[PDB]
RNA sequence: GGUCAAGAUAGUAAGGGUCCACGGUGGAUGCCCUGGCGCUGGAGCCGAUGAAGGACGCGAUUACCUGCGAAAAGCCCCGA
RNA sequence: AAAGGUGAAAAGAACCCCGGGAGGGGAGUGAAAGAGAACCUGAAACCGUGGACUUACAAGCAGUCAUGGCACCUUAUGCG
RNA sequence: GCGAGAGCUAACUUCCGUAGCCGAGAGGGAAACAACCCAGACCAUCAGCUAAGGUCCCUAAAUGAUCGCUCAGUGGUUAA
RNA sequence: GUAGGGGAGCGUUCAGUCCGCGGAGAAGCCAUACCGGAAGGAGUGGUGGAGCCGACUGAAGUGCGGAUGCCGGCAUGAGUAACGAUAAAAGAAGUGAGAAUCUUCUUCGCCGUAAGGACAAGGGUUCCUGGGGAAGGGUCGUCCGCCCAGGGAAAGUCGG
């Protein structure tokens, strides 16, 4: 009867390379559309990461550099994206649900910054 | 290897299928584009969900 | 020359089938099962036909002794006193006479009493 | 009246509110399930529930619900605000067969069924009682 | 695993061949019999 | 006729059953002949002037059959 | 191996409508489209849709008999 | 069931003799129950008498009559 | 009343003869509460679109529930088990009637004495180009090794 933090859809390694990859893309696009699930999971993972970028030191930048493998996305989050949320108590990310799909019939959604 | 013993009847099978009735979506009129869409979701027609979101 | 079974089997089977009405499921629908049902149906028909007369025998008795017991006799006593009078070959269906007609069966009870003691 | 021969030429015999989709590769049993909620309701409502109902079967049932209303309006001069599904139903159809497999008892148990249409239909009509 | 049938052009031909089937007369028997049996064609075209 | 009490009693069908009505599926049955079957009779061998049976070709358009044959779905003479 | 059937005649359905289509609905032709090319009849299994009377304390070869209830009246107001 | 042999004076045993039934026998009785008890079904009936069996309620029919016996639920598990 | 013997008959096809019926509708098919001692046979209704009852005699490939019988069709299991290797995907962009599945971009993971490359044998246009979307594709499909058309293969020296 598990009472636990994480959900995985898949294996131990992939849960990461995914949450990393989708976080990278949200930061790059500013909103993306994915399954309601992957969205729901991605939400706090990306938020804790905006906070790593807030605070602005090289330490922080190099921490963010661990889940963000593209220098331009990390530069954006660090110099552009982080600061802009300043007076923000934390948690700008939000979940909008678009609707169902054809092939698999799976309800999808927008995660937006 | 554990096979069924008899053809199940027309009445028994139609009885088992008793529960398979689809539950029709409860819809609602969109306050903005006034076309029927669904709760806690974006109106596919106008794109408006509390103000406006998707490019329609 | 060759005579196929055409148009023969079908009429036959429909004839069989048609007896079947409130017949449940394949009994009323598939041939072989229907016809087969109509074998045991034969048994119960004829035999319970001879039986129905036993059944009504039972009913009428069950009524007559009831009226009797109501008036102080019983079937043994009532029919005894009845026969004891060469008078009543009444016998058959006397039940309804007891059911519908109170004072009549009172007179038959009293009378059959006279024919006893 | 006259005789049957004459009854045939005196009347063309129309079909009000009727249209049918033959031979849609789908399962009757399946399509039935969609079609059931549609049945007997306001034709607009019908188009909406049909919009949002997640079975893929729902689509060719939608494509038809219109085509029958379409016939109902244009061909039968009907009044669309009084329109509703009077009836609809799913009748099976000619189960699809390919060239193969043909072989007795050799790796022989498999489907190759690809079941028949269900035929769709939906007769449309006007409210009456209101 | 490895099947019964390992297709070979110079085999399917060196036996079964019209030439081959004509080499002996039990063969040519097979030939003309096959002919009268309807047109059942001999391996060079098969 | 209003609230207590004690009684009895209907109806609702998620789904099922029987009958009826109307479709669908299927292709039996009736009708039919473009195909067979054996009786009787007729006729009865072809091939080194290349058989039987085929291969590949021929056509404005040609994939199957038919018909032919680098003179190729044909060529010349006579008869109708 | 299975193998057949519009129609007397292609008159084989312009044109309109729903649809990418398939498919259908009109129009028109036709004696008939209750023949429309999944084109003679179209049985039975089998799948549905609508109606009638019914069924959610009852042990069951599915019937048979007997009485009551409800419904229907074209060999047919009862003999149903 | 009767008269024997085998057998253990066992067996829903086995082998003969003898009646009767089942076999090929429905109907009533013995809860159920081929053979046992009563009785052999041509057809119809919502008519009557009885057989074996029965007559408290589940089912038809004396919770009958007189004289007793048993106090064990014997009745409704065998003996020394 | 079982094997078995005997008697009367019912129905189906063909055949000869007789009476006939049919486009104001034949056979067949569908419903039915009537007739007959039974096999059965009528009446009216509904379909159907060419043929067909009845009587008398004759001849049979002449009467099906079973044969794990034959062919065909359609059920049950049931919307069940499965969708063919636990080398993962993700977002943007495009097209389109419709895209989780096609296209492009950016990443991610997998093989790398292979899961790269070149031949043989075998297969036979599967290659390329342009179209297509019924079936084939274990879902989808705008896509393909699928369907349509058109192109493409060049040797004194390579192999014969
Ligand atoms: Mg948990
Ligand atoms: Mg790892
Ligand atoms: Mg971390
Ligand atoms: Mg319901
Ligand atoms: Mg037809
Ligand atoms: Mg014995
Ligand atoms: Mg015997
Ligand atoms: Mg038999
Ligand atoms: Mg199961
Ligand atoms: Mg399961
Ligand atoms: Mg597919």
Swiss-Prot record, chain A:
Binds to the 23S rRNA. GO terms for biological process: translation. Pfam families: Ribosomal_L17. This is Large ribosomal subunit protein bL17. One of its GO terms (molecular function) is rRNA binding. PROSITE patterns: RIBOSOMAL_L17. It comes from the Bacteria. One of its GO terms (cellular component) is cytosolic large ribosomal subunit. Part of the 50S ribosomal subunit. Contacts proteins L3 and L32. It comes from Deinococcus radiodurans (strain ATCC 13939 / DSM 20539 / JCM 16871 / CCUG 27074 / LMG 4051 / NBRC 15346 / NCIMB 9279 / VKM B-1422 / R1). The keyword rRNA-binding applies. InterPro entries: Ribosomal_bL17 (IPR000456), Ribosomal_bL17_CS (IPR047859), Ribosomal_bL17_sf (IPR036373). Keywords: Ribonucleoprotein, Ribosomal protein, RNA-binding, rRNA-binding. Belongs to the bacterial ribosomal protein bL17 family.
UniProtKB/Swiss-Prot annotation, chain B:
It holds the Pfam family Ribosomal_L32p. Part of the 50S ribosomal subunit. Contacts proteins L17 and L22. A zinc finger (C4-type) spans 30-46. Residues 1-20 have a biased composition (Basic residues). Transmembrane segments: none annotated. InterPro entries: Ribosomal_bL32, Ribosomal_bL32_bact, Ribosomal_zn-bd. This is Large ribosomal subunit protein bL32. The keyword Metal-binding applies.
From Swiss-Prot, chain C:
InterPro entries: Ribosomal_bL20, RIBOSOMAL_L20_CS, Ribosomal_protein_bL20_C. Pfam families: Ribosomal_L20 (PF00453). It comes from the Bacteria. GO terms for biological process: ribosomal large subunit assembly; translation. GO terms for molecular function: rRNA binding; structural constituent of ribosome. The keyword Ribonucleoprotein applies. Keywords: Ribonucleoprotein, Ribosomal protein, RNA-binding, rRNA-binding. CDD domains: Ribosomal_L20. The keyword RNA-binding applies. GO terms for cellular component: cytosolic large ribosomal subunit. Belongs to the bacterial ribosomal protein bL20 family. NCBIfam families: rplT_bact. Part of the 50S ribosomal subunit. Contacts proteins L13 and L21. Binds directly to 23S rRNA, probably serving to organize its structure. This is Large ribosomal subunit protein bL20. It comes from Deinococcus radiodurans (strain ATCC 13939 / DSM 20539 / JCM 16871 / CCUG 27074 / LMG 4051 / NBRC 15346 / NCIMB 9279 / VKM B-1422 / R1).
Curated annotation (Swiss-Prot), chain D:
It comes from the Bacteria. This protein binds specifically to 23S rRNA; its binding is stimulated by other ribosomal proteins, e.g. L4, L17, and L20. It is important during the early stages of 50S assembly. It makes multiple contacts with different domains of the 23S rRNA in the assembled 50S subunit and ribosome. The globular domain of the protein is located by the polypeptide exit tunnel on the outside of the subunit while an extended beta-hairpin forms part of the wall of the tunnel. Forms a pair of 'tweezers' with L32 that hold together two different domains of the 23S rRNA. Interacts with the tunnel-blocking modified macrolide azithromycin. Upon binding of the macrolide troleadomycin to the ribosome, the tip of the beta-hairpin is displaced, which severely restricts the tunnel. This is Large ribosomal subunit protein uL22. Keywords: Ribonucleoprotein, Ribosomal protein, RNA-binding, rRNA-binding. Part of the 50S ribosomal subunit. Contacts protein L32. It comes from Deinococcus radiodurans (strain ATCC 13939 / DSM 20539 / JCM 16871 / CCUG 27074 / LMG 4051 / NBRC 15346 / NCIMB 9279 / VKM B-1422 / R1). The keyword RNA-binding applies. GO terms for cellular component: cytosolic large ribosomal subunit. One of its GO terms (molecular function) is structural constituent of ribosome. InterPro entries: Ribosomal_uL22, Ribosomal_uL22_bac/chlpt-type, Ribosomal_uL22_bac/org-type, Ribosomal_uL22_CS, Ribosomal_uL22_sf.
């Amino acid at each position: 009867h598990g009472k636990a933090g994480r959900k995985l859809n898949r294996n131990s390694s992939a849960r990461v390379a995914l949450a990393r990859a989708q976080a990278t893309a949200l930061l790059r696009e500013g909103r993306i559309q994915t399954t309601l699930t992957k969205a729901k999971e991605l939400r706090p993972f990306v938020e804790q990461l905006i906070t790593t970028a807030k605070g602005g030191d090289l330490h922080s930048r190099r921490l963010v550099a661990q889940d963000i493998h593209d220098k331009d996305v990390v530069r954006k989050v660090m110099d552009e994206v982080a600061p802009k949320y300043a007076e923000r108590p934390g948690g700008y990310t939000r979940i909008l649900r678009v609707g169902t799909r054809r092939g698999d019939g799976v309800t999808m959604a927008l995660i937006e910054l | 290897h554990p096979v069924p013993k008899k053809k199940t009847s027309k009445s028994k099978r139609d009885m088992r299928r008793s529960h398979h009735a689809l539950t029709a979506p409860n819809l609602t009129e969109c306050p903005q584009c006034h076309g029927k869409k669904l709760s806690h979701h974006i109106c596919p027609n106008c794109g408006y969900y509390d103000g406006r979101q998707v490019l329609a | 020359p060759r005579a196929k079974t055409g148009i023969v089997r079908r009429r036959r089977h429909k004839k069989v089938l048609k007896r079947a009405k409130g017949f449940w499921g394949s009994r009323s629908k598939q041939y072989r099962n229907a016809f087969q049902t109509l074998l045991n149906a034969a048994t119960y028909e004829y035999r319970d036909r001879r039986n129905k007369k036993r059944d009504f025998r039972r009913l009428w008795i069950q009524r007559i002794n009831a009226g009797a017991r109501l008036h102080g006799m019983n079937y043994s006593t009532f029919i005894n006193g009845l026969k004891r009078a060469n008078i009543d070959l009444n016998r058959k269906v006397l039940a309804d006479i007891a059911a519908r007609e109170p004072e009549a069966f009172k007179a038959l009870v009293d009378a059959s009493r006279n024919a006893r003691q | 009246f006259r005789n049957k021969k004459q009854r045939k030429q005196q009347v063309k015999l129309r079909k009000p509110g009727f249209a049918v989709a033959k031979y849609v590769r789908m399962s009757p049993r399946k399509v039935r399930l969609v079609v059931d909620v549609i049945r007997g309701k306001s034709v607009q409502d019908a188009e909406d529930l049909l919009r949002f109902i997640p079975r893929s079967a729902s689509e060719p049932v939608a494509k038809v619900l219109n085509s029958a209303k379409a016939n109902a309006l244009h061909n039968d001069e009907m009044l669309e605000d009084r329109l509703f599904v009077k009836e609809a139903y799913v009748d099976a159809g000619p189960t699809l067969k390919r060239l193969i497999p043909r072989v007795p008892r050799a790796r022989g148990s498999a489907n190759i069924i690809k079941k028949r249409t269900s035929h769709i239909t939906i007769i449309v009509a006007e409210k009456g009682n209101k | 695993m490895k099947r019964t049938y390992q297709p070979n052009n110079r085999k399917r031909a060196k036996t079964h061949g019209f030439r081959a089937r004509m080499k002996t007369k039990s063969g040519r028997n097979i030939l003309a019999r096959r002919r009268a049996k309807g047109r059942h064609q001999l391996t060079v075209s098969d």
